Design a protein around this ligand. Structure first.
Ligand SMILES: [Mg+2]
Ligand SMILES: [Mg+2]
Ligand SMILES: [Mg+2]
Ligand SMILES: [Mg+2]
Ligand SMILES: [Mg+2]
Ligand SMILES: [Mg+2]
Ligand SMILES: [Mg+2]
Ligand SMILES: [Mg+2]
Ligand SMILES: [Mg+2]
Ligand SMILES: [Mg+2]
Ligand SMILES: [Mg+2]
Ligand SMILES: [Mg+2]
Ligand SMILES: [Mg+2]
Ligand SMILES: [Mg+2]
Ligand SMILES: [Mg+2]
Ligand SMILES: [Mg+2]
Ligand SMILES: [Mg+2]
Ligand SMILES: [Mg+2]
Ligand SMILES: [Mg+2]
Ligand SMILES: [Mg+2]
Ligand SMILES: [Mg+2]
Ligand SMILES: [Mg+2]
Ligand SMILES: [Mg+2]
Ligand SMILES: [Mg+2]
Ligand SMILES: [Mg+2]
Ligand SMILES: [Mg+2]
Ligand SMILES: [Mg+2]
Ligand SMILES: [Mg+2]
Ligand SMILES: [Mg+2]
Ligand SMILES: [Mg+2]
Ligand SMILES: [Mg+2]
Ligand SMILES: [Mg+2]
Ligand SMILES: [Mg+2]
Ligand SMILES: [Mg+2]
Ligand SMILES: [Mg+2]
Ligand SMILES: [Mg+2]
Ligand SMILES: [Mg+2]
Ligand SMILES: [Mg+2]
Ligand SMILES: [Mg+2]
Ligand SMILES: [Mg+2]
Ligand SMILES: [Mg+2]
Ligand SMILES: [Mg+2]
Ligand SMILES: [Mg+2]
Ligand SMILES: [Mg+2]
Ligand SMILES: [Mg+2]
Ligand SMILES: [Mg+2]
Ligand SMILES: [Mg+2]
Ligand SMILES: [Mg+2]
Ligand SMILES: [Mg+2]
Ligand SMILES: [Mg+2]
Ligand SMILES: [Mg+2]
Ligand SMILES: [Mg+2]
Lengths: 214, 113, 118, 54, 122
RNA sequence: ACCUCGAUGUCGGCUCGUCGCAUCCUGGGGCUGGAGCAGGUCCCAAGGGUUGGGCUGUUCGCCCAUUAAAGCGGCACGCGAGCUGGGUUUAGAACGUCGUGAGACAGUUCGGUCUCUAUCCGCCGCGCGCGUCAGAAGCUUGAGGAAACCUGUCCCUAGUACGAGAGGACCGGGACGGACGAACCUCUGGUAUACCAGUUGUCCCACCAGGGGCACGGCUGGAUAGCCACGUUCGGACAGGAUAACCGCUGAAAGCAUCUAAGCGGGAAACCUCUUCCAAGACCAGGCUUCUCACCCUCUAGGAGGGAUAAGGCCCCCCGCAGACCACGGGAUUGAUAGACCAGACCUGGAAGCCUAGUAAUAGGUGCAGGGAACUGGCACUAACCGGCCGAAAACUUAC
RNA sequence: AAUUCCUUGUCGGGUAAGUUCCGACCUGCACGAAUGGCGUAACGACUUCUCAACUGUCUCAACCAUAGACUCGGCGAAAU
RNA sequence: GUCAGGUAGAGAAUACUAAGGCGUACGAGUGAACUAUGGUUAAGGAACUCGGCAAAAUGCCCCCGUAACUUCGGGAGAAG
């Protein structure tokens, strides 16, 4: 079944292969998770496992949230997320209260990493959509970065939905597929993933076994 | 102090000599051709050292057959075996990019005495 | 300290440098000044780094302070009075207190003070 | 670009209703024995006598 | 990092001195030629005695670039000049001698004869 | 000559696109005067792709290098309240030509003001309100949308099939690329207006020394964080379903024959799934849970009106790599949220003072020195407060 | 040809590629001798073509500062 | 129209500054897009475009050294 774990992006560094090739890696704190809830086709209509991650003072947890952790018999955690599972045999592999660690993965496995991309604020069309903008000279009047035309004429006499324009950019859910796990550090609880993963350092990510190359 | 020091410490190499920009060095580089593996020496002047930890790099400049060549290495690269320092230089700055424009006698660096 | 993220106080980097220096001088001379809240918040770290040089006390530290404070009388006060007074306190030499907005432009105003308690 | 038509009474008022002040939240402070109301932002200054309670 | 209209010194004894890059080969819209990439070029300057005269259209392979090139090991190579060797359709030089050092990349790109004749390969 | 002359601005280029298929490439096929390679022609197919230069105001066209290919058209010959203004088509001037002349020329030549603070619809983003039959909170299903969809070369199979030879495969495997998109900052590279160093002119701090102000940050050499591309990593599947052209099986009407009339099958980058993202204002306003589940007063005993609360929330406060505002995320003394402070990392490159050498400019020692932001870890010294405002249930029918 | 409609005439030069440019040919639609003809050193913010140097003009765009834009307080228009 | 301080400098240019005079009448905030005005830029270097438009570049003093052509003055600060 499709393994997965919640974690925190720690930062990027560099390691060397055994054939001396350089490998850029992002370090993911694949911290211990606890199974807080199991979704079943008979209760919920679908199969999934609910995971909890990150330390939290019980002073900070709101009472209805504490009630759900109490019903599960586990200490509250900051972040709760579901991993969707295809079938009930996969659900059977999990039990409430059970702890998951980085060691669910092995070196050379392919993972998909999901995170929130960095915020870019209100972005122009050149930055947000890669518009070419206009000439810096040859008479061009105050349109160096302007988007140009946004439609035809009397027909259709309107701007189509989906027309690319300026606006808020970033802070989106992004999944990067088929990243190689270079190393698993069981002692530090860390994944070294080759390549980039979405998000700022310290941000929540979800590491799952790759659908396409799993 | 770095967040990822506990990862990088595993790859840090211990046989690195101390050297500074302006020193003449001999960098023994592993090179593969076919199946045989040999060592090729790159002799020149260290013109810069930037970064830190396992990502620190240094750049060596040589004049070869009338053509300037610069070679940049990860300090802790396992593709290097020996770095041998030959002369200490007298320089007044961390980055020796001005050497890129100089030739011959004027490109020479003063030695430590 | 951490540079201003947005546009500088005074409408230029050079005016901001002069403004911070003048505000520090005033703060040390009187012990308490009232200004706009952004200026007060910008002054706090700048003034505290100067007080640190004063606590160190050496000739080197004095010259460093003089790079920003041109009032020699205030420099004397920093090294003979304010410095010694804070010898045992590790950071936190100033306090910011929010006060009433200014009438003519509704500018938020703050008082910044040297801490006297200990 | 100029307005094409006059704006209906209703449309004007709907937009114009968004131009309004919001009341400051006020807290009580005892000064000179009397209890006055001041913004929570000014609570510390009012006890220190830095606020002109007219 | 060579492109159309970039001029390169000639690194062999064919008799050309400068070539002008006309097209980087190896795909539609391909922007940049690096070490080991084949270009089409015109001869802009020639030695009076040369076998190849000014205005001839020739094929050449880039052997030196000013823009630093990354290697698998995380190392970099950089030269003070851009230089190309005039090639024929069998990847052999048209000249008999190669001047100056060449990049390792030529070996990966199968220009063995050029690697052989180069005074140094770096 | 039907709308517009109380105004609907033109060619070409630029920017941004969107649609058709009469298809340029890639995909699937029938027939060939198809041996093979490579084609000819016709059928099906619009998912994606469809280069950069020389000449000309040009469109067009010719040419030079490439490419899998450098498609044809519609949208006021798309797009000037988005840009340009070279051509044309105001006023100046000149040539040829015509005119007695004033002048004229789908003849030519040089020059010649491109205005507007967006009300409405529309589009890209972001809030506030109310609703989803008590008030709240965590995690969710996915009706329905959006995005993505390109392709080469070389090496095996194989110098095999085919072929006199020359030449040279289908199908099936593997490696390495071009273009494009996304995320990201370890590396490379760019930037740096409170970082460090050098240095010119001048004024100042009485003066020397050491510094500061101004001259683009005066200039020059570097430069962590942030942002970023020239950088790094990853992507386009794999499989299934229903089909197009086409190939059929089994078969009558019509003793034969026929893919079709009853029935049963193969079959493509198009379609539906599959991959990524949005998504219950999806008014059929969903689901699985958890928390609060409580009280006073007035009208009349109907329904309401008001006040105080619970869970929770908001505002104020300390902030953020979150940000136009707002929102969002975190912290709020039972506290490391920000600053300071201490230490490290990193950047700069050897401070001042003193001593020594030199006539001096200057050099050396003290000393990986001194200075310093963003990154990391400690540390309640400073500020996060002796607090305000919101916020919980008419009933009734049938089934069990 | 500041004159040539046909016309991007034809040949030569320059460029990888030149409807422009330079040198020629004469088939001058429709040159020509004080509405002067043909030249000419010097001169030109004239017009035209080529080269070196140089560069964000461009490949291809990134980052910084300031003035607006944006937020808060005050005053407070306009075309339509 | 009349006075013309000082240090650099050929100078009444320009930079800083003395005497003297001002801060001149909306402000306070804030790293949005976008526009304006300045700044820097890897590799390439006119490929931009009607056209090198706009930028960049050259720039001072003292020596050396300067072609075609010419109306004999020039060209000429040629160029380097
Ligand atoms: Mg304008
Ligand atoms: Mg402009
Ligand atoms: Mg260093
Ligand atoms: Mg900044
Ligand atoms: Mg301002
Ligand atoms: Mg300045
Ligand atoms: Mg009629
Ligand atoms: Mg009208
Ligand atoms: Mg068709
Ligand atoms: Mg499709
Ligand atoms: Mg049109
Ligand atoms: Mg229009
Ligand atoms: Mg006229
Ligand atoms: Mg006449
Ligand atoms: Mg003009
Ligand atoms: Mg004209
Ligand atoms: Mg005209
Ligand atoms: Mg759906
Ligand atoms: Mg709908
Ligand atoms: Mg992006
Ligand atoms: Mg970094
Ligand atoms: Mg400084
Ligand atoms: Mg003095
Ligand atoms: Mg002095
Ligand atoms: Mg001054
Ligand atoms: Mg600088
Ligand atoms: Mg620099
Ligand atoms: Mg619901
Ligand atoms: Mg709010
Ligand atoms: Mg012609
Ligand atoms: Mg010709
Ligand atoms: Mg001619
Ligand atoms: Mg005449
Ligand atoms: Mg006559
Ligand atoms: Mg006459
Ligand atoms: Mg005349
Ligand atoms: Mg003029
Ligand atoms: Mg502003
Ligand atoms: Mg206002
Ligand atoms: Mg003077
Ligand atoms: Mg002046
Ligand atoms: Mg006035
Ligand atoms: Mg003002
Ligand atoms: Mg701004
Ligand atoms: Mg550049
Ligand atoms: Mg450069
Ligand atoms: Mg061009
Ligand atoms: Mg062009
Ligand atoms: Mg042209
Ligand atoms: Mg110009
Ligand atoms: Mg300039
Ligand atoms: Mg001349």
């Amino acid at each position: 079944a499709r393994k997965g774990i919640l974690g925190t992006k720690l930062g990027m560094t560099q390691v060397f292969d055994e054939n001396n090739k350089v490998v850029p890696v992002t370090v993911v704190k694949a911290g211990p998770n606890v199974v807080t809830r199991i979704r079943t086709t008979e209760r919920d209509g679908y199969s999934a496992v609910q995971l909890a991650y990150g330390e939290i003072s019980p002073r900070k947890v709101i009472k209805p949230v504490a009630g759900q952790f109490a019903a599960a018999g586990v200490n509250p955690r900051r972040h709760v997320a579901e991993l969707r599972l295809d079938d009930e045999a996969a659900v059977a592999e999990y039990e409430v209260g059970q702890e998951l660690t980085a060691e669910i993965f092995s070196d050379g496995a392919y993972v998909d990493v999901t995170g929130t991309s960095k915020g870019k604020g209100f972005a122009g069309t050149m930055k947000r959509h890669g518009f070419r903008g206009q000439g810096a000279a040859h008479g061009a009047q105050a349109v160096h970065r302007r988007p140009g035309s946004i439609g035809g004429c009397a027909t259709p006499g309107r701007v189509f939905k989906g027309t690319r324009m300026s606006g808020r950019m970033g802070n989106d859910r992004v999944t990067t597929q088929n990243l190689k796990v270079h190393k698993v550090d069981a002692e530090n609880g860390v994944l070294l993933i080759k390549g980039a993963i979405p998000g700022r350092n310290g941000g929540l990510v979800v590491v799952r076994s790759a659908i396409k190359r799993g | 102090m770095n967040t990822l020091d506990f990862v990088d410490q595993a790859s840090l190499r211990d046989d690195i000599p101390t050297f500074s920009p302006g020193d003449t060095v001999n960098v023994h580089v592993k090179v593969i051709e076919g199946s045989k593996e040999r060592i090729q020496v790159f002799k020149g002047v260290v013109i810069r050292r930037q970064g830190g930890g396992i990502s620190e790099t240094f750049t060596v400049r040589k004049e070869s057959y009338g053509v300037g060549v610069e070679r940049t290495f990860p300090v802790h690269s396992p593709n290097i075996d020996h770095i041998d320092v030959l002369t200490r230089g007298d320089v007044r700055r961390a980055k020796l990019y001005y050497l890129r424009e100089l030739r011959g006698k004027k490109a020479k660096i003063k030695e430590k005495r | 300290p951490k540079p201003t993220k947005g546009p500088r106080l005074g409408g230029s980097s050079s005016h901001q440098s002069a403004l911070l220096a003048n505000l520090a001088t005033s703060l040390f001379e009187h012990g308490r000044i009232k200004t706009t809240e952004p200026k007060a918040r910008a002054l706090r770290p700048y003034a505290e780094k100067l007080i640190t040089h004063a606590k160190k006390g050496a000739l080197h530290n004095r010259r460093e302070v003089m790079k920003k404070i041109r009032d020699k009388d205030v420099v004397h006060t920093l090294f003979a009075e304010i410095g010694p007074f804070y010898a045992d306190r590790n950071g936190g030499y100033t306090r910011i207190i929010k006060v009433e907005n200014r009438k003519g432009d509704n500018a938020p105003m703050a008082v910044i003070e040297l801490v006297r308690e200990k | 670009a100029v307005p094409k038509r006059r704006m209906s009474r209703a449309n004007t008022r709907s937009r114009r209703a968004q131009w309004k002040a919001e009341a400051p939240g006020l807290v009580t402070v005892s000064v000179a024995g009397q209890q006055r109301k001041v913004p929570r932002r000014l609570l510390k200054a009012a006890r220190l006598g830095l606020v002109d309670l007219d | 990092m060579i492109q159309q209209e970039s001029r390169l010194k000639v690194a062999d004894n064919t008799g050309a001195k400068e070539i002008l890059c006309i097209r980087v080969l190896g795909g539609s819209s391909r922007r940049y030629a690096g070490i080991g990439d084949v270009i089409v070029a015109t001869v802009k300057d020639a030695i009076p005695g040369g076998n190849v005269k000014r205005g001839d259209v020739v094929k050449a392979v880039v052997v030196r670039t000013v823009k630093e090139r990354r290697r698998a090991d995380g190392s970099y190579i950089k030269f003070d000049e851009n230089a190309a060797v005039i090639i024929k359709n069998d990847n052999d030089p048209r000249g008999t001698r190669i001047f100056g050092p060449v990049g390792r990349e030529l070996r990966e790109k199968k220009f063995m004869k050029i690697v052989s004749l180069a005074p140094e390969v770096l």
